[PDB]
């Protein structure tokens, strides 16, 4: 049977930062953090490899692929936690950024 998904897409990312919102378009094959930086948004990061808490966020709406991350356990992923350096949007998304301090490990 046929495939439904587009080869390419642009997804609107809304970041809810601690004090404001900023928005930009993100290609389907660009990580949230990278697309934000391309727009000059200064988001926290360190390893950029999915294995730490620096870039943590929380997904409020939409859907993300986070198969490339490793530090968050499956339950944390199910509970909405995001490593923005290793997440791809598969829809328009709203993500709260700067959420490192809310994690445990
Ligand atoms: S910066 Fe370490 S997991 Fe994203």
Author numbering: -7 to 97
Question: What text appears in the publication on this structure?
Answer:
The noncanonical amino acid, para‐cyanophenylalanine (CNF), when incorporated into metalloproteins, functions as an infrared spectroscopic probe for the redox state of iron‐sulfur clusters, offering a strategy for determining electron occupancy in the electron transport chains of complex metalloenzymes. In conclusion, we have incorporated the noncanonical amino acid, CNF, into two FeS proteins, and in each case observed a small, reproducible shift (<2 cm−1) in the nitrile stretching band of CNF following cluster reduction and re‐oxidation, which is consistent with an electric field effect from proximity to the cluster(s) in different redox states. We also obtained high‐resolution crystal structures of CNF‐labeled proteins in both the oxidized and reduced states, demonstrating that site‐specific placement of CNF caused minimal structural perturbation, and giving a precise location for the CNF side chain in each protein. In the multicenter hydrogenase, DdHydAB, the nitrile group of CNF is 12 and 13 Å from the [4Fe–4S] proximal cluster and the [4Fe–4S]H subcluster of the H‐cluster, respectively; the fact that spectroscopic changes are observed at this distance confirm that this functional group has long‐range sensitivity to redox changes. These investigations lay the foundation for employing site‐specifically incorporated CNF to probe the redox state of FeS cluster‐containing proteins by IR spectroscopy.
We first selected spinach ferredoxin I (FdI) and incorporated CNF close to the [2Fe–2S] cluster. Mutation of Tyr in position 37 (Y37) gave protein variants with equivalent UV–visible spectra and cluster reduction potentials to the WT FdI, while variants at other sites gave abnormal spectral features. Therefore, site 37 was selected for site‐specific replacement with CNF, to generate the FdI variant ‘Y37CNF’. The IR spectra of Y37CNF FdI in the as‐isolated state in solution show a low‐intensity but clear nitrile stretching band at 2236.2 cm−1 (top) close to that of free CNF measured in the same buffer solution (2237 cm−1). We then applied electrochemical control to the solution of Y37CNF FdI in an IR spectro‐electrochemical cell, Figure 1A (middle and bottom). At −5 mV, the spectrum exactly resembled the as‐isolated protein, while at −650 mV, a redshift of 1.7 cm−1 was observed in the band from CNF. Crystal structures of WT FdI and variant Y37CNF were solved at near‐atomic resolution for both oxidized and reduced states of the protein. Site‐specific replacement of tyrosine with CNF causes a small change in conformation of the side chain relative to the native enzyme. This shift is sufficient to alter the crystal packing, placing the CNF side chain in a slightly different environment within the lattice relative to the native Tyr, however, comparison of the structures of oxidized and reduced Y37CNF FdI demonstrates that the redox state of Fe does not influence the geometry of the side chain relative to the [2Fe–2S] cluster position.
